[PDB]
XYZ file of C-alpha atoms in Angstrom:
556
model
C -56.125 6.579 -8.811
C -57.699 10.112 -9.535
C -57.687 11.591 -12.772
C -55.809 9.004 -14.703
C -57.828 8.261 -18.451
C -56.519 10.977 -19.755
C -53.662 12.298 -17.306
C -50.264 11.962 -17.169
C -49.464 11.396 -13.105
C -47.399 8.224 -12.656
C -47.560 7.622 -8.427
C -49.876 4.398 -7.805
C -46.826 1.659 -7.247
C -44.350 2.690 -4.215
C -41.726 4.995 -5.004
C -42.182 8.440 -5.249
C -42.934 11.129 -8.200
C -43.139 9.697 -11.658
C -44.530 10.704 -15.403
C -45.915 8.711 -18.343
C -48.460 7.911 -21.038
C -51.006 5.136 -20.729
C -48.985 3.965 -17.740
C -45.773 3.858 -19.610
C -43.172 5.569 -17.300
C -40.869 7.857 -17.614
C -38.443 9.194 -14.790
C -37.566 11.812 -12.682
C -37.668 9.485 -9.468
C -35.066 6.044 -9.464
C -37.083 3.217 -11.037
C -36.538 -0.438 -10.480
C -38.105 -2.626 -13.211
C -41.368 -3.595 -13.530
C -43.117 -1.505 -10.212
C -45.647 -3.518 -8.285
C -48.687 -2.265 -8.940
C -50.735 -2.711 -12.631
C -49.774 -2.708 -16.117
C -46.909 -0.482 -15.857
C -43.889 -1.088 -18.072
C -41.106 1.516 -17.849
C -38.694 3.165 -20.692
C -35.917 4.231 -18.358
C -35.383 7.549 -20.347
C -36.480 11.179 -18.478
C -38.721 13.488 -18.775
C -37.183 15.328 -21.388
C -37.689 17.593 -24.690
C -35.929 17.350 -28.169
C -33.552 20.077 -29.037
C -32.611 21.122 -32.648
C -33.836 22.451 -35.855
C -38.039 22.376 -35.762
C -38.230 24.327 -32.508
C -39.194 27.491 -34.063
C -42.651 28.778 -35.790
C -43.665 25.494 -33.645
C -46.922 25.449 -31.064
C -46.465 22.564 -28.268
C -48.629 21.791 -25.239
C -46.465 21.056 -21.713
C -44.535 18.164 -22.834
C -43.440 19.472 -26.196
C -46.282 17.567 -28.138
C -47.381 19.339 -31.370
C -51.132 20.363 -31.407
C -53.957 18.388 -33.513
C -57.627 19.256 -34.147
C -58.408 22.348 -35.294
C -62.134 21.852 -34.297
C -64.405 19.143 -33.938
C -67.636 20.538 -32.527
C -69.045 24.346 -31.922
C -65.882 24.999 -30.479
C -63.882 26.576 -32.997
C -59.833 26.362 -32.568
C -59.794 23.597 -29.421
C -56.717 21.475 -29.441
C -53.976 19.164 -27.569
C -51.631 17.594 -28.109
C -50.854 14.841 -30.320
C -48.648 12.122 -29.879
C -45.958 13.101 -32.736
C -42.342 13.833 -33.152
C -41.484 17.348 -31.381
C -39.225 17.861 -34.198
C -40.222 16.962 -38.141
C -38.337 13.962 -39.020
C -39.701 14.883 -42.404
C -38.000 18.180 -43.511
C -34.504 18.634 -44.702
C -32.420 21.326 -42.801
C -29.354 22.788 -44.939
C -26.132 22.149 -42.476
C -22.852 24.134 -42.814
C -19.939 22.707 -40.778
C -18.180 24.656 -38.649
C -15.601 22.163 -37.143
C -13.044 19.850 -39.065
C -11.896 16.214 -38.414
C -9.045 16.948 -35.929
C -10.775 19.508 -33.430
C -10.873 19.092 -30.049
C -14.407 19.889 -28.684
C -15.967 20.151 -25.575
C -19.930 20.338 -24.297
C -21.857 23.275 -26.215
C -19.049 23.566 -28.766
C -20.405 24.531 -31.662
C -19.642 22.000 -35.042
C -22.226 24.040 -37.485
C -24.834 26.263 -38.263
C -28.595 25.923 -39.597
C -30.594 28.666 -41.030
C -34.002 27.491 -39.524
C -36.224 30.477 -40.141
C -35.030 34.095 -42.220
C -34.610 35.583 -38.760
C -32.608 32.563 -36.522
C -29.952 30.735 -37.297
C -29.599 27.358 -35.402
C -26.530 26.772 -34.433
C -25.499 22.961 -33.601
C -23.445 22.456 -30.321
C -21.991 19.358 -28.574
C -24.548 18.060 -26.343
C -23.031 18.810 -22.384
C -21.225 15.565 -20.961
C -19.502 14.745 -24.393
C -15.787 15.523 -25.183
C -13.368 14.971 -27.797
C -12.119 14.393 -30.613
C -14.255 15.177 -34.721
C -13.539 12.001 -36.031
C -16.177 12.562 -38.748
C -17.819 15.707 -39.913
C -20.919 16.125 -42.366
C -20.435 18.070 -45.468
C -22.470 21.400 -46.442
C -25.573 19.840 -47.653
C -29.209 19.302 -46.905
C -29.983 16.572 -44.033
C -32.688 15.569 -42.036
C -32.913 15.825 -38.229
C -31.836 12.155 -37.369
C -28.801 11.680 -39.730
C -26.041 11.542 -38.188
C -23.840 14.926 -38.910
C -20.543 14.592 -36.452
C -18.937 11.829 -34.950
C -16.994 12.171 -31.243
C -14.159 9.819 -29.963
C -13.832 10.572 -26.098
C -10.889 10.200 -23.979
C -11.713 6.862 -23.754
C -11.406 5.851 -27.484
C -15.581 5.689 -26.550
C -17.217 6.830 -30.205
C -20.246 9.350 -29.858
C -22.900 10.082 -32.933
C -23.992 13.639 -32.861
C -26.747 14.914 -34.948
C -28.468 18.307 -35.204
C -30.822 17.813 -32.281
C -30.502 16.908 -28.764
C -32.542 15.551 -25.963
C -32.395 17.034 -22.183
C -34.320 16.337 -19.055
C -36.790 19.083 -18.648
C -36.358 18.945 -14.741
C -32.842 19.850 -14.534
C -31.108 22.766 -15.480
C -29.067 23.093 -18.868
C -25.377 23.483 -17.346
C -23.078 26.001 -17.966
C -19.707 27.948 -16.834
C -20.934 30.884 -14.757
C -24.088 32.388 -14.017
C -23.329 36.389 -14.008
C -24.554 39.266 -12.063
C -27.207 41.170 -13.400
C -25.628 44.122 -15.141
C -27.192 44.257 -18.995
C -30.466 45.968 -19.092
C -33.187 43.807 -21.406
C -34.255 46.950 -23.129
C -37.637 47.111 -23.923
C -38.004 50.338 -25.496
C -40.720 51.321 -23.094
C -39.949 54.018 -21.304
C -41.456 53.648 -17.886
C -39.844 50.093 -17.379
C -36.238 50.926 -19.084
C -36.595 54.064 -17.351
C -37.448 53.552 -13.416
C -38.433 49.627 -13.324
C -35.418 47.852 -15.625
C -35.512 44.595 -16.451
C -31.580 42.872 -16.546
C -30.862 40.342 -19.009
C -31.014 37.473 -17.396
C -33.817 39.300 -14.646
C -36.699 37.983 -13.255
C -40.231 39.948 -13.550
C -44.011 39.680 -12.480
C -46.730 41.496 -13.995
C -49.654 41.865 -11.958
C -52.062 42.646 -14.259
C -55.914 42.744 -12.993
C -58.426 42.422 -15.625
C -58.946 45.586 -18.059
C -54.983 47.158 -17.358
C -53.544 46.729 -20.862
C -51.823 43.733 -19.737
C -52.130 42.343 -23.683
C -50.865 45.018 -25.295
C -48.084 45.760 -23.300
C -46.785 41.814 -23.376
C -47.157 42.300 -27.197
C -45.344 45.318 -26.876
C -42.278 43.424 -24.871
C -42.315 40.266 -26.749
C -41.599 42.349 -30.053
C -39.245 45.307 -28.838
C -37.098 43.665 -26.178
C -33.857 43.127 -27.257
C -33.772 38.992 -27.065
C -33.369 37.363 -30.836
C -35.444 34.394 -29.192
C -39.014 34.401 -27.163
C -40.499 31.721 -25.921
C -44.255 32.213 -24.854
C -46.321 29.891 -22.373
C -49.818 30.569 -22.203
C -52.999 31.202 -24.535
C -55.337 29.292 -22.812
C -56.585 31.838 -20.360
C -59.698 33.144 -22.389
C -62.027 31.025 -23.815
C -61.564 32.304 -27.003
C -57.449 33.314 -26.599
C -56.295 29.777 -28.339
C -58.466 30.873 -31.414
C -56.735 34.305 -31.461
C -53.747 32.560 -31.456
C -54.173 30.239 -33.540
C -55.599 32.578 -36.495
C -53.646 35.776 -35.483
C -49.972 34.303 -34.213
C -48.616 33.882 -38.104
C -50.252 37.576 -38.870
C -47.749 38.691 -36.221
C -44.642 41.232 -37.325
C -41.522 40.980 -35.958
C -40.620 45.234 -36.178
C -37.247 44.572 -36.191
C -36.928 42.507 -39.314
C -40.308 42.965 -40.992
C -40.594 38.526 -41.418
C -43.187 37.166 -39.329
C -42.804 37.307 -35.283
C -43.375 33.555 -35.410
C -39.774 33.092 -37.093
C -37.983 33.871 -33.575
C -40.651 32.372 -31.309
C -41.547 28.914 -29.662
C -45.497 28.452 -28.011
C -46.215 26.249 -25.013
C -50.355 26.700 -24.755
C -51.842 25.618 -21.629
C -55.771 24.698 -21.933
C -58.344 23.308 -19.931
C -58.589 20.158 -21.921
C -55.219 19.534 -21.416
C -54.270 17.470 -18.871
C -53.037 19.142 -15.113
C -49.508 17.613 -15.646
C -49.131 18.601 -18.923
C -49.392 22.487 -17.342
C -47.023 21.390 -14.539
C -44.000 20.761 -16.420
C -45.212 22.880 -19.290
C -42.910 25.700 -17.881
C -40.118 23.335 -17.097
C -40.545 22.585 -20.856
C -40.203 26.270 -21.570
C -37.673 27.195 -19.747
C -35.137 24.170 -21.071
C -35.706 25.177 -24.640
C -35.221 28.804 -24.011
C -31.987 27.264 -21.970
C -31.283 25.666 -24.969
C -31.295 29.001 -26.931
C -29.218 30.774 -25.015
C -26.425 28.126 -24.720
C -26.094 29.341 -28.303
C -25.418 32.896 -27.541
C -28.824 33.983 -27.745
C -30.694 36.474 -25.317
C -33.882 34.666 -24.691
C -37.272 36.127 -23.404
C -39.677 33.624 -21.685
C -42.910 35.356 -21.176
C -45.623 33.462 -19.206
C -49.142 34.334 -19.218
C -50.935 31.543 -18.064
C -51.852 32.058 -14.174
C -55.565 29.842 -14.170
C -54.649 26.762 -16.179
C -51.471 26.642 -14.253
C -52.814 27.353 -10.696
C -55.005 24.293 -10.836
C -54.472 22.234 -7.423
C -54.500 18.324 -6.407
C -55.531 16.301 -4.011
C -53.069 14.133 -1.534
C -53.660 11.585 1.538
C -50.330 10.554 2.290
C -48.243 12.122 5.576
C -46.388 14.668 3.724
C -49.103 16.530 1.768
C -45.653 19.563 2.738
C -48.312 21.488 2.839
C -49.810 23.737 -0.234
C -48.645 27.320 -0.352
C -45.349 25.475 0.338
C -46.117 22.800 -2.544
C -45.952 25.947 -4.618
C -42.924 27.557 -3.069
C -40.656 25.144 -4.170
C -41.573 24.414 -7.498
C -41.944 28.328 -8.639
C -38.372 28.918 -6.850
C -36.486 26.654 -8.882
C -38.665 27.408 -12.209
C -37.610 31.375 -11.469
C -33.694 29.895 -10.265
C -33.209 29.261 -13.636
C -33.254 32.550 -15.106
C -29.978 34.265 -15.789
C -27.099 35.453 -17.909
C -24.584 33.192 -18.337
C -20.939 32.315 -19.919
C -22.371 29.246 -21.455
C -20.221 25.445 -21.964
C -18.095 25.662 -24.800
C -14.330 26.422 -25.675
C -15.117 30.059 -27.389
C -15.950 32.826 -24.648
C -19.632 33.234 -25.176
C -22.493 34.840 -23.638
C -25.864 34.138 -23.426
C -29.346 34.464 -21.238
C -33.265 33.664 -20.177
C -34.898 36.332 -18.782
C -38.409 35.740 -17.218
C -41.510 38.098 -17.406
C -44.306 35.852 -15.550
C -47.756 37.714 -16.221
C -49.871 37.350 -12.848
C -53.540 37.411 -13.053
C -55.889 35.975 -11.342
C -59.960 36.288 -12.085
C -60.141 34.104 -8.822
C -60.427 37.488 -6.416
C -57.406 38.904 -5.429
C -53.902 38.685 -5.684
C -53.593 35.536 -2.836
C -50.975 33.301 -1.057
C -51.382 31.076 -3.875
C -49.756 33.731 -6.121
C -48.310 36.871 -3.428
C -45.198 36.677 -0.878
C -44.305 33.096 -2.206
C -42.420 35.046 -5.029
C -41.274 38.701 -2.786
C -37.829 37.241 -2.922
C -36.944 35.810 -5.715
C -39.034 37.960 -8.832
C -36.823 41.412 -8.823
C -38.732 43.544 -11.041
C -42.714 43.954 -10.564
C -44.545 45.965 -13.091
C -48.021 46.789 -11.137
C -51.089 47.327 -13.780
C -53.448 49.215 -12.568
C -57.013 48.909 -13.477
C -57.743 52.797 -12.454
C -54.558 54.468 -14.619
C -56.311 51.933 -17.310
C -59.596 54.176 -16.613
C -57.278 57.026 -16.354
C -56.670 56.402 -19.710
C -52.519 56.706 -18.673
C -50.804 54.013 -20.852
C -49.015 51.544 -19.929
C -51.194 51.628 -16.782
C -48.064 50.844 -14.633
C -48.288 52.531 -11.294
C -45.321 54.133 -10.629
C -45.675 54.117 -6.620
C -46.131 50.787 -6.176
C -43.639 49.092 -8.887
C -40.143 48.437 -8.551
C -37.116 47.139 -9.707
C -34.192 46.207 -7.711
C -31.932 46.348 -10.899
C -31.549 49.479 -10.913
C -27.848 49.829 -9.251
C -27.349 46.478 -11.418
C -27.834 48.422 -14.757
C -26.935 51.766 -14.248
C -23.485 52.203 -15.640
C -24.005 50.268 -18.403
C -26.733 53.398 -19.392
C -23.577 55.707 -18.069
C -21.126 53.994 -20.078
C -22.831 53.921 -23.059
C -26.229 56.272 -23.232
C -25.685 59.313 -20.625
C -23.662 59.414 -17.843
C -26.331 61.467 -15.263
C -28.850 58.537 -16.576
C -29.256 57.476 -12.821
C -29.072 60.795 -11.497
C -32.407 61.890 -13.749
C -33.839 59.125 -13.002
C -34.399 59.406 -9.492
C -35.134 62.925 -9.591
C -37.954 62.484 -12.047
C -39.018 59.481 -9.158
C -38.305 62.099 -6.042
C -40.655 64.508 -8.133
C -43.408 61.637 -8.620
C -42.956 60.959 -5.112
C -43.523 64.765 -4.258
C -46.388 64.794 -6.323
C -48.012 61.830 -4.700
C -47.758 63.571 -1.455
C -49.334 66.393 -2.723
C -52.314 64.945 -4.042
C -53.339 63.486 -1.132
C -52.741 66.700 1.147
C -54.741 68.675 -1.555
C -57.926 66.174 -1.606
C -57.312 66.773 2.298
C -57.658 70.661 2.023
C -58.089 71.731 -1.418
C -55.284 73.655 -3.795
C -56.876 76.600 -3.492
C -53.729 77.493 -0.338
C -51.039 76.260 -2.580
C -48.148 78.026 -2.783
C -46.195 78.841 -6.459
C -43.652 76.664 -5.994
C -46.268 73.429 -5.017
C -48.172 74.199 -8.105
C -45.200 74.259 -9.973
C -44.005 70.950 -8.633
C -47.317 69.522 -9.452
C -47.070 70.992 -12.980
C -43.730 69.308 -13.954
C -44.927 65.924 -12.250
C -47.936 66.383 -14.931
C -45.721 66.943 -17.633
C -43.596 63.916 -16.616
C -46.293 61.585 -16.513
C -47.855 63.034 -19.611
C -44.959 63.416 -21.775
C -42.804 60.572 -20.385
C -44.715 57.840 -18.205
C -47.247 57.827 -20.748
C -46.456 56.056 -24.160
C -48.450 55.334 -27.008
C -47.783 51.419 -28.620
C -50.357 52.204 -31.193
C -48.095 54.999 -33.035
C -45.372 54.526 -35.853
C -42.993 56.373 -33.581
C -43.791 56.173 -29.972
C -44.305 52.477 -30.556
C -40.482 52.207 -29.289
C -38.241 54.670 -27.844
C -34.724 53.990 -28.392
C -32.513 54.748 -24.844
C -31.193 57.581 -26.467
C -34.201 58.955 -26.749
C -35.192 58.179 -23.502
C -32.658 60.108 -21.707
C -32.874 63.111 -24.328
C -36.436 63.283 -23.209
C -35.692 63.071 -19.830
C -32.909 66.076 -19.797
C -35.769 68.076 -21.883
C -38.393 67.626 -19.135
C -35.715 68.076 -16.257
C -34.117 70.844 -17.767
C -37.462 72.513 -17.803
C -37.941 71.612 -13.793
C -34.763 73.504 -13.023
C -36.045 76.713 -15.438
C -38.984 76.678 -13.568
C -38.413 76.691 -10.355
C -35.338 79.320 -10.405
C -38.581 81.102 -12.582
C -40.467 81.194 -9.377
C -37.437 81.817 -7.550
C -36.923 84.999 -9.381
C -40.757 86.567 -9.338
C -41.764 84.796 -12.791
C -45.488 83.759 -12.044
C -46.556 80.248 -12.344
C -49.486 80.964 -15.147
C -46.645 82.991 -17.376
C -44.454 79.143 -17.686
C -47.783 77.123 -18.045
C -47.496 78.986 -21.298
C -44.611 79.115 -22.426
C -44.689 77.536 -26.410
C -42.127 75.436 -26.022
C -44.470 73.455 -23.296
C -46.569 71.793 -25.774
C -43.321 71.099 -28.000
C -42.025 69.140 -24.690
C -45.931 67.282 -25.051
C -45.493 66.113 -28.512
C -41.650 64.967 -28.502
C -42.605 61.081 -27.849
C -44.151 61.740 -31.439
C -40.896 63.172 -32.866
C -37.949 60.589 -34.682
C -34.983 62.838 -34.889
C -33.565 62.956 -31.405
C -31.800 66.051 -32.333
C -34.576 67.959 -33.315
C -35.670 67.051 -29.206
C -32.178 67.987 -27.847
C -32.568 71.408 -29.086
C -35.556 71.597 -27.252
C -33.297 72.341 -23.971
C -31.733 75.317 -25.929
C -35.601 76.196 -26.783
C -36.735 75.811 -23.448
C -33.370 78.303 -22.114
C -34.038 80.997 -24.381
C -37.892 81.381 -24.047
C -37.399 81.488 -19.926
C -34.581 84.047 -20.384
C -37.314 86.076 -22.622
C -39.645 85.611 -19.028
C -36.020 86.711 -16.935
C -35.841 90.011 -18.912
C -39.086 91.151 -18.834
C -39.320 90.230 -15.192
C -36.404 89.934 -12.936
């Protein structure tokens, strides 16, 4: 029977996987009555979550279950989840209709609008499957989540109530039109990742993130700068002490963008070891349907996960098929990460919307194993390696630049040359060749020494300094650098390639090395992360001309 008092595992009668509470089971498996086996009852109904107005502001555990104590013992901020309504039956929500008796809708049509927080408004589609005909329409006023606010004839005369919430099965995927190639960057604002590892709205990411790499600062850096209206966050169980942060420190949270409170545009799943192993293995099936959910709207959605231990947990099998483990876990993370996308969503308007996944990867159990490694190589496209020596480096974000990628590169690219700068590729892997140069370098040079090096190596090895200095490197605790805007980014970029070019027809002309290491306008091309006005940087380049002609003239 196994861990069953306080579980949620429902295989004991004869068919296959099942779910419930105090043996009371729900389906993802066909049921047939009463099972053989003990007191076991069935509902019929999935495993599913609730879908409306109530979402938002809202901390769940992995079934959507609202969280209780706030302590009990020594343990200060410990909870679970309580058996309540996912959704306040309680509060009224003021509906404005956005359909008439008369319409013809279809699945994710939407029939009105909710302002749920001052940041989102909720807007209230068809659930998929149902067709029609607005027979009846609510009227601007304040309901709660249960009335009834639309009613549906289908083809078949059949009459369907629609309120402001839906249900949906948490193991299969929201529906929609078209799922669409990767081609919108999710900008972050961070320059290393926008820059040389892009995320795509719609992408999939890891971060491996050993302990000590600034792996909380930079997720707090994406969760508020990306450009999704909508994150939903699965973790906060992986410190002792992280669901007491959270709990006390969550609602302190800005939102930079607005100035309301971060908690306005976000939805928590918290994984703890309290919690029950099946509520932590649907718990990002239960993300990922609400963020779904989001995005059916219109929304760009950011699901962050950062909750490798409590997930990870394993369990024990007898039976013949037992396919293996680090196959167990190939399946199940393939077709959490399938999910993730941009999409033309169900509805009769044209409309756009996506999830894009950032799964944070660390693991205090050793290394980065099979039960985390090459199960994933295919399917996550973006990996943005921490590294715990650039964190004692003191280089921030401590991504390592030689051993990240992205393979959405060629997937975003003329979006940034249609709109930002059309050499935005182009710089971009120059500034990587010249990384790549650099890397090379240093490990010839602790090899022999630089005292051999000739005037254009040191020169290469300056630039690739100033790069990661004035570019890699970017500071999330300052007013400005905090985000850099793309057109920014590439306006920095030109500065610090422009210089590359000065310098090495410098060297190619007789200029010494130690005359550009110098030059003024150097330490102006060090500071410009700290500067607002991207015009003030742009005339940096003219700067940066005028002080090596100065160096031509007085040389050759």
């Amino acid at each position: 029977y196994e861990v069953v008092r306080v579980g949620e595992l429902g295989l004991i009668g004869e068919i296959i996987r099942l779910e419930g509470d105090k043996a009371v089971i729900q389906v993802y498996e066909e049921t047939a009555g009463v099972r053989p086996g003990e007191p076991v009852v069935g509902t019929g109904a999935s495993l599913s979550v609730e879908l409306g107005p109530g979402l938002l502001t809202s901390i769940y555990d992995g079934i959507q279950r609202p969280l209780e104590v706030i302590r009990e013992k020594t343990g200060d901020f410990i909870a679970r989840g309580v058996t309540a309504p996912a959704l306040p039956r309680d509060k009224k929500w003021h509906f404005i209709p956005k359909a008439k008796v008369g319409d013809k809708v279809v699945g994710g049509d939407i029939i009105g609008e909710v302002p749920e927080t001052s940041i989102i408004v909720h807007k209230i589609m068809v659930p998929p499957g149902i067709e029609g005909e607005i027979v009846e329409i609510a009227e601007e006023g304040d309901y709660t989540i249960e009335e009834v606010i639309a009613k549906v004839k289908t083809p078949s005369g059949e009459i369907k109530e629609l309120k402001m919430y839906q249900r949906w099965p948490v193991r299969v995927k929201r529906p929609y039109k078209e799922k669409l190639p990767p081609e919108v960057p999710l900008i972050t604002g961070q320059r290393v990742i926008d820059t040389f590892f892009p995320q795509a709205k719609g992408g999939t990411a890891a971060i491996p993130a050993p302990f000590g790499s600034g792996k909380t600062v930079t997720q707090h850096q994406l969760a508020k700068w990306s450009d999704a209206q909508v994150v939903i966050y699965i973790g906060c169980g992986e410190r002792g002490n992280e669901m007491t942060d959270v709990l006390e420190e969550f609602p302190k949270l800005k939102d930079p963008k607005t100035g309301k409170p971060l908690m306005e545009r976000t939805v928590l799943i918290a994984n703890t070891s309290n919690m029950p192993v099946a509520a932590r293995e649907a718990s990002i099936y239960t993300g990922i349907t609400i963020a779904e959910y989001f995005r059916d709207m219109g929304y760009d959605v950011a699901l962050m996960a950062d909750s490798t231990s409590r997930w990870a947990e394993a369990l024990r099998e007898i039976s013949g098929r037992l396919e293996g483990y680090p196959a167990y876990l190939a399946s199940k993370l393939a077709e959490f990460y399938e999910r993730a996308g941009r999409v033309v969503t169900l509805g009769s308007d044209y409309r756009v919307g996506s999830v894009s996944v950032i799964g944070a990867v660390s693991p205090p159990g050793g290394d980065f194993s099979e039960p985390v490694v090459q199960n994933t190589l295919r399917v996550v496209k973006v990996f943005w390696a921490l590294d715990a020596d650039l964190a004692r480096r003191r280089h921030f974000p401590a991504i390592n630049w030689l051993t990240s990628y992205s393979l959405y590169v060629d997937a975003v690219k003329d979006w940034w040359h249609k709109n930002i700068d059309p050499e935005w590729k182009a710089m971009r892997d120059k500034a990587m060749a010249l990384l790549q140069k650099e890397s090379e370098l240093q490990e010839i040079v602790r090899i022999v020494g630089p005292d051999a090096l000739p005037e254009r190596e040191r020169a290469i090895l300056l630039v690739a300094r100033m790069l990661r200095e004035d570019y890699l490197q970017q500071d999330a605790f300052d007013e400005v650098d905090t985000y850099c805007p793309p057109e920014k980014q590439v306006t920095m970029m030109r500065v610090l390639l422009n210089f590359y070019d000065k310098t090495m027809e410098a060297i190619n002309r007789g200029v010494p090395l130690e005359e550009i290491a110098k030059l003024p306008v150097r330490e102006e091309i060090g500071r410009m992360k700290f500067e607002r006005d991207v015009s003030k940087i742009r005339s940096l380049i003219d700067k940066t001309n005028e002080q090596f002609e100065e160096l031509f003239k007085k040389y050759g």
